[PDB]
Design an enzyme around this catalytic site. Structure first.
Site, PDB file in Angstrom:
ATOM      1  N   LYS A  54       0.810  -1.214   0.000  1.00 29.11           N
ATOM      2  CA  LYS A  54       0.000   0.000   0.000  1.00 29.11           C
ATOM      3  C   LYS A  54       0.847   1.270   0.000  1.00 29.11           C
ATOM      4  CE  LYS A  54      -4.025   2.189   2.185  1.00 29.11           C
ATOM      5  NZ  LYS A  54      -3.332   3.521   2.028  1.00 29.11           N
ATOM      6  N   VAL A  59      -1.476   1.457  -5.384  1.00 28.69           N
ATOM      7  CA  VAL A  59      -2.000   0.405  -4.522  1.00 28.69           C
ATOM      8  C   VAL A  59      -2.693   1.069  -3.340  1.00 28.69           C
ATOM      9  CG1 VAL A  59      -1.449  -1.565  -3.083  1.00 28.69           C
ATOM     10  CG2 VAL A  59      -0.282  -1.274  -5.254  1.00 28.69           C
ATOM     11  N   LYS A  66      -6.617  -7.478  -0.771  1.00 27.99           N
ATOM     12  CA  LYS A  66      -6.541  -8.616  -1.678  1.00 27.99           C
ATOM     13  C   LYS A  66      -5.202  -9.329  -1.528  1.00 27.99           C
ATOM     14  CE  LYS A  66      -9.811  -7.487  -5.340  1.00 27.99           C
ATOM     15  NZ  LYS A  66     -10.614  -6.846  -4.261  1.00 27.99           N
ATOM     16  N   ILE A 100     -13.856  -7.381 -31.362  1.00 25.33           N
ATOM     17  CA  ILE A 100     -14.856  -7.697 -30.342  1.00 25.33           C
ATOM     18  C   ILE A 100     -14.450  -6.977 -29.067  1.00 25.33           C
ATOM     19  CG2 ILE A 100     -16.043  -9.494 -28.999  1.00 25.33           C
ATOM     20  CD1 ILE A 100     -15.615 -11.456 -31.189  1.00 25.33           C
ATOM     21  N   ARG A 143       4.099 -12.531 -30.615  1.00 25.20           N
ATOM     22  CA  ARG A 143       4.956 -11.370 -30.736  1.00 25.20           C
ATOM     23  C   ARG A 143       5.788 -11.487 -32.010  1.00 25.20           C
ATOM     24  NH1 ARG A 143       4.802  -7.719 -27.189  1.00 25.20           N
ATOM     25  NH2 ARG A 143       6.858  -6.902 -27.796  1.00 25.20           N
ATOM     26  N   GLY A 183       4.740  -6.068 -30.676  1.00 22.23           N
ATOM     27  CA  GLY A 183       3.398  -6.612 -30.769  1.00 22.23           C
ATOM     28  C   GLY A 183       2.767  -6.351 -32.125  1.00 22.23           C
ATOM     29  N   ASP A 184       3.189  -5.280 -32.788  1.00 17.73           N
ATOM     30  CA  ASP A 184       2.663  -4.894 -34.092  1.00 17.73           C
ATOM     31  C   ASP A 184       3.685  -3.954 -34.724  1.00 17.73           C
ATOM     32  OD1 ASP A 184       2.323  -2.638 -32.555  1.00 17.73           O
ATOM     33  OD2 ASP A 184       0.129  -2.567 -32.727  1.00 17.73           O
ATOM     34  N   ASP A 186       4.022  -0.028 -36.323  1.00 17.49           N
ATOM     35  CA  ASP A 186       3.425   1.313 -36.339  1.00 17.49           C
ATOM     36  C   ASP A 186       4.256   2.185 -37.255  1.00 17.49           C
ATOM     37  OD1 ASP A 186       1.459   3.119 -35.567  1.00 17.49           O
ATOM     38  OD2 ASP A 186       2.341   3.596 -33.702  1.00 17.49           O
ATOM     39  N   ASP A 248      -0.191  -0.679 -38.629  1.00 18.85           N
ATOM     40  CA  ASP A 248      -0.914   0.578 -38.748  1.00 18.85           C
ATOM     41  C   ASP A 248      -0.033   1.559 -39.504  1.00 18.85           C
ATOM     42  OD1 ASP A 248      -2.922  -0.539 -37.109  1.00 18.85           O
ATOM     43  OD2 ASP A 248      -2.140   0.444 -35.289  1.00 18.85           O
TER      44      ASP A 248
HETATM   45 NA    NA Z   1     -11.123  -7.395 -28.869  1.00 20.30          NA
HETATM   46 NA    NA Z   2      -0.521   3.516  -2.282  1.00 21.64          NA
HETATM   47 NA    NA Z   3      -8.891  -7.570 -26.392  1.00 20.78          NA
END
Ligand code: NA
Ligand code: NA
Ligand code: NA
Ligand code: NA
Length: 327
Positions: A54, A59, A66, A100, A143, A183-184, A186, A248
């Site tokens: 914390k 946090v 948790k 989606i 990747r 990841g892609d 650009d 992209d």
């Molecule tokens: Na999606």
């Molecule tokens: Na904190």
């Molecule tokens: Na997604």
DNA sequence: CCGACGGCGCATAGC
DNA sequence: GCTCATGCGC
DNA sequence: GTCGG
């Protein structure tokens, strides 16, 4: 810090993040959980208690609570429960198809469309983007090793120059900062004929050439200034074919190009830091422009920018190489 | 207490 | 037919 | 969910 330190916690928080963003449609809680996971991922000790966590920014009381449950029991009851909930685990899963989102995933599951197989049987109900996302579901989660990124860049830069040698093109993202994988891809595109004060086929001609040499294989969306699609390296005579990849391409006016290159190179934390320091020196930097702030905070006109370095010079920063922009 | 937590290009109800 | 809010991805 | 005005 390696996974063995706080991996269990950060996996838990990331799972919680996804359910907030795909099932509960609580985007700000998704980002809250992501922020917490990342500040924990950078903490160089195995966490002993929620109270210890914390003290980290992002946090708070509930994530501390948790972490206490996770540490004492090795699980989280609410996460265990949602994991086995057929409706919520299906909604969450379906959002991994590009196109989606939470809304589409929610309506599909409400109709009993719950799996990849179910989407396959219901193409009628999928828009164009979603069909592409379905077709390349596995490939899109892979990747891209940097050697392939270099081969992809070779093609993009060659074809762009072939269309018009006055185009300027820059592959940005973590790849431009030296990343070992991506990841892609650009791609940022400009042309001297295109300024903020000035044709509607500059982007289209480049996309068309990349399609003609069969590098671009599918189109997710394409307008006058931004293209999002799919591409694939060619494979040799006998070799296994390469995965299809996300690419992209954006066309930016020349007078905003290097602000754009700066921004889309990042990293995100570097961008925050640079903009914070720009405010302190009396400038506002966004994706497009750098502008002076008046003594009452009123922004002036965009300042002329002809290189990334010009931006660093405006704010009295020494020019940082892309490789040194992790923060 | 209670608003902000990124903003925008492109594809896809309501008049 | 049109404008445009919503969804989506980034 | 967390932060901060
Ligand atoms: Na999606
Ligand atoms: Na904190
Ligand atoms: Na997604
Ligand atoms: Na030329």
């Amino acid at each position: 810090p390696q996974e063995t330190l706080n991996g269990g916690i950060t996996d838990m928080l990331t799972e919680l993040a996804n359910f907030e963003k795909n099932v509960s449609q609580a985007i700000h809680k998704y980002n809250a959980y992501r922020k917490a996971a990342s500040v924990i991922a950078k903490y160089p000790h195995k966490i002993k208690s929620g109270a210890e966590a914390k003290k980290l920014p992002g946090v708070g009381t509930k994530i501390a609570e948790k972490i206490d449950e996770f540490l004492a029991t090795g699980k989280l009851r609410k996460l265990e429960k949602i994991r086995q909930d057929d409706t919520s685990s299906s909604i969450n899963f379906l959002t991994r198809v590009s196109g989606i989102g939470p809304s589409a995933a929610r309506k599909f599951v409400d109709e009993g469309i719950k799996t990849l197989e179910d989407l396959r049987k219901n193409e009628d109900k999928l828009n164009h983007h979603q069909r592409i996302g379905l077709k390349y579901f596995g490939d899109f989660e892979k990747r891209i090793p940097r050697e392939e990124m270099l081969q992809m860049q070779d093609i993009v830069l060659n074809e762009v120059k072939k269309v018009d040698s006055e185009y300027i093109a820059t592959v940005c993202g973590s790849f431009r900062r030296g990343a070992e994988s991506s990841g892609d891809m650009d791609v940022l595109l400009t042309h001297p004929s295109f300024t903020s004060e000035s044709q509607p086929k500059l982007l289209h001609q480049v996309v068309e050439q990349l399609q003609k040499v069969h590098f671009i294989t599918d189109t997710l969306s394409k307008g006058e200034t931004k293209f999002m699609g799919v591409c694939q390296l060619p494979s040799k005579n006998d070799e296994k074919e390469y995965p299809h990849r996300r690419i992209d391409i954006r066309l930016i006016p020349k007078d905003q190009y290097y602000c754009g290159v700066l921004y889309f190179t990042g990293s995100d934390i570097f961008n925050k830091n640079m903009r914070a320091h720009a405010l302190e020196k009396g400038f506002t930097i966004n994706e497009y422009t750098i502008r002076p702030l008046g003594v009452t905070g009123v922004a002036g006109e965009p300042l002329p920018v002809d290189s990334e370095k010009d931006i660093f010079d405006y704010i009295q920063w020494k020019y940082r190489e892309p490789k040194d922009r992790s923060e």
